[PDB]
Design a protein around this ligand. Structure first.
Ligand SMILES: O=C(OCCO)c1ccc(C(=O)OCCO)cc1
Length: 497
């Protein structure tokens, strides 16, 4: 059972059970406590002897998901301060040059962890892939911009963990030259951010963007506003020097309140006109700080960032229904609301018709959901694929179309449902995908992910702007499709950002 591997910071003890060596809670950065909430991740103190790497470590401080989301997306909080840790699954640490997959969890930069059961790496290890997951700093601590703190610590954490992988994964049987980094949404947007970040150079050879693209950044001045509001509500200065002492429950509380206010209609008196106008999608997304992130990841990618990196990208067909549907309130959304929403992107009311004509929404709420799926995920994802037309690296796309049965099927192929199929952790995600999700689909998606990590090819035709081909994952039939939803797609050609 017990298996001991040398890391850069000293020896770790995992456990091999059934030809899988599992290491949990390998620290890649010192506990980011107090002032170190907001410092660059520090190499862990290089211990002598054997540190236990058998239990998942603490996870980053996060608020609960909203009641709606949270019933579907059941997080596993692990208390503690020492959460800048990573987990490795390998079939054999003595293996030569196994594909390494580094998982960057999503959760809108405020939630999630590497260690959520659904992100279990065993299924990747069983297929000859070294799997790495890890926690990175979230929310205020991870990403709120402060004048006296390096920006985007959660991003610096991701780099640190990817650098850990670079420096250590060979001792867990992995090829540091064959690292596929992958993430869901905020994790995928992170990947996009990393492609745009000098400090991530060469840290991954391939990327799987699962329902996340290069549009999730906060302008510096909006991050400054967010930090200021956070601070005013904490009765302290908008500085790391101040926030280093706020009890995390009060950080999270104010953080949570910022998240909801930005998710809703932000008061312009509180937030300024930009943020009230919607300049901020996610308020704790990486800040365009100028150094780590000189520009929005989409523009960097449009200019060739990550073009040397093989890309498997995709979205869930009904992604945003996760956020609009599970409270039973989709039917109350109105056409004029969709029209006003369309108008924010300079689209006329009748753009909604294209959604209806393409099976993407009978009622306004259905359309809004699809519109938002397009605006924040599918079109940004496609803009990345389009930017890579001349990239030396390969681009493959997918659409996760399997509709979850939960809540009478109201969710469709909503956000996150592809996670347990990717990880073959379907029995850990029944709150989201129900009790009897098709395991064949899990095998299919997972093997494609394994194939992509292994060779840069998921096993289906490459995505190009000619045919815009993607693997439409569903059950019983996952089959290639071409240029899915072209009319709604063509709606966004001139839409800013
Ligand atoms: O809709 C989103 O942002 C637009 C704001 O209006 C959104 C972004 C990221 C995530 C995420 O990281 O989900 C992964 C959960 O495992 C979820 C939702």
């Amino acid at each position: 059972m017990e298996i001991v591997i040398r890391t850069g910071s000293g020896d770790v003890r995992g456990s091999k059970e059934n030809g899988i060596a599992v290491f949990r809670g390998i620290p890649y950065a010192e506990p980011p406590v107090g002032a170190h909430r907001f410092t660059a991740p520090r190499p862990p103190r290089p211990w002598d002897g054997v540190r236990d790497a058998t239990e998942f470590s603490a996870t980053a401080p996060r608020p609960p998901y909203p009641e709606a989301i949270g019933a579907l997306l059941i997080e596993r909080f692990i208390p503690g301060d020492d959460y800048l840790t990573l987990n490795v699954w390998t079939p054999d640490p003595n293996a030569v040059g196994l594909p390494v997959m580094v998982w960057i969890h999503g959760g809108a930069f405020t939630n999630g962890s590497g260690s959520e059961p659904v992100y279990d790496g065993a299924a990747f290890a069983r297929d000859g892939v070294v799997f790495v997951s890890f926690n990175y700093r979230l929310g205020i601590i991870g990403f709120a911009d402060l004048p006296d703190a390096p920006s985007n610590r959660g991003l610096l954490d991701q780099i640190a963990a990817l650098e850990w992988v670079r420096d250590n994964i060979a001792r867990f049987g992995g090829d540091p030259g064959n690292v596929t980094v992958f993430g869901e949404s905020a994790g995928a947007m992170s990947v996009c951010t990393l492609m745009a970040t000098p400090r991530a150079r060469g840290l991954f050879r391939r990327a799987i963007l699962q329902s996340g693209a290069g549009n999730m950044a906060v302008a510096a001045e909006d991050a400054t506003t967010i930090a200021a509001v956070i601070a005013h509500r904490l009765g302290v200065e908008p500085t790391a020097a101040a926030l280093a002492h706020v009890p995390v429950a009060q950080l999270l509380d104010v953080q949570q309140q910022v998240a909801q206010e930005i998710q809703g209609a932000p008061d312009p008196a509180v937030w300024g006109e930009r943020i009230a106008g919607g300049s901020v999608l996610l308020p704790f997304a990486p800040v365009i700080d100028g150094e780590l992130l000189s520009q929005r990841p989409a523009e960097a990618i449009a200019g060739g960032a990550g073009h040397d990196v093989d890309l498997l990208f995709g979205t869930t067909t009904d992604l945003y229904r996760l956020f609009l549907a599970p409270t039973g309130l989709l039917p109350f959304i109105t056409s004029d609301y969709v029209t006003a929403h369309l108008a924010k992107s300079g689209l006329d009311a009748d753009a909604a018709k294209a959604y209806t004509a393409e099976g993407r929404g009978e009622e306004p709420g259905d359309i809004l959901a699809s519109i938002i799926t397009d605006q924040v995920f599918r079109i940004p994802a496609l803009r990345i694929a389009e930017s890579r037309v001349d990239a030396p690296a390969r681009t493959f796309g997918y659409e996760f179309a399997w509709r979850t049965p939960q809540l009478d099927g109201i969710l469709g192929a909503c956000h996150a449902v592809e996670l347990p199929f990717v990880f073959r952790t379907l029995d850990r995600a029944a709150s989201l995908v129900g009790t009897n999700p098709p395991e064949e689909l899990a095998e299919t998606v997972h093997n494609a992910w394994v194939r992509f990590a292994t060779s840069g090819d998921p096993g289906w035709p490459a995505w190009n702007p000619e045919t815009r081909s993607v693997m439409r994952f569903d059950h019983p039939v996952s089959e290639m499709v071409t240029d899915p939803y072209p009319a709604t797609r063509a709606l966004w050609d001139g839409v800013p950002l």
